[PDB]
């Protein structure tokens with residue numbers, strides 16, 4: 001189909017974004033007055049919180065670039081998740097018959 | 098129906114996730130350099146904030162596992178709530194006649 | 195209509211929740227080891243952040259009850275806003291002709 | 292069309308809100324007991340976090356007005372993003388034929 005397949009697949013996109021932003025924000029903060037976004041195994045848990053947009057505050061970028069990577073990893077979530085909602089929004093309309 | 102019943106019921110699923118993650122993240126952090134996620138009556142209020150994805154920051158996991166439980170209790174919310182939006186999105190289309 | 199009127203009106207409901215939770219969480223925290231949720235003009239800005247679910251962390255309840263009021267003022271937002279999305283989701287389908 | 296064009300365009304609205312709230316919250320906090328919302332290049336990253344509603348906590352307004360600008364820059368996001376979800380919700384229904 002699409003509405004049901006454009007989603008199940010997109011997520012496989014967000015996950016890339018995560019791992020992508022993770023091992024990129026680090027190399028953007030690793031050397032500077034910034035928080036623990038100086039470790040790959042740390043950026044991960046950050047990508048996730050950011051992507052889910054929960055913002056624990058426990059971690060965040062301070063590097064101009066690191067902040068960019070944040071924005072990206074953000075929409076990725078607001079978006080990657082939106083589709084899943086879209087998918088469901090129609091699969092509830094697919095019961096109009 | 099479905100669109101209107103697949104929701105009212107799913108929530109009864111998220112609530113399980115809460116209580117589920119609550120009394121699981123604790124036993125994952127209870128003994129370690131981590132925050133108050135060392136008390137069941139505390140993990141709760143955390144499951145909720147996390148699930149609603151508000152991330153007060155007042156509490157969060159530091160245990161690799163405790164972080165997993167977080168992720169889970171997270172989607173549960175982004176999702177459990179999405180349906181409710183889906184439900185409503187169609188119940189507004191159910192006025193096309 | 196509905197999809198377009200059930201929303202514009204619901205918000206007038208959330209706003210009540212705000213002012214409602216505001217001047218209720220205070221009288222729940224006002225006298226205790228809790229944060230500034232001890233002032234009505236402060237609970238407001240909290241209801242808002244909470245309702246929008248942004249969780250600055252700058253403020254939060256510590257009173258068991260105050261935490262309840264939080265939950266409420268939370269869904270109110272996840273929900274009150276969901277409808278508005280629902281409304282829009284259909285007003286985009288109302289262009290199928 | 293609309294559902295697909297009312298979105299791609301709205302965002303160009305939120306971005307204005309950002310830059311708009313950015314260089315406005317500052318001049319509202321710049322001179323007071325408030326956080327770094329005293330620098331334009333700082334308010335930005337705040338508008339974004341706020342707009343995405345992630346609330347890192349790293350920054351927030353304390354000025355009554357600065358708090359207003361927050362609210363605004365908030366809905367702008369909850370809303371500007373909602374449409375995009377709406378758009379997608381229908382573009383999944385546009386496969387009912």
Ligand SMILES: [K+]
Pocket residue numbers: 052053054149150151246247248343344345
């Ligand atoms: K959020």
Ligand SMILES: [K+]
Pocket residue numbers: 053054055150151152247248249344345346
């Ligand atoms: K948040």
Ligand SMILES: [K+]
Pocket residue numbers: 055056057152153154249250251346347348
């Ligand atoms: K926070």
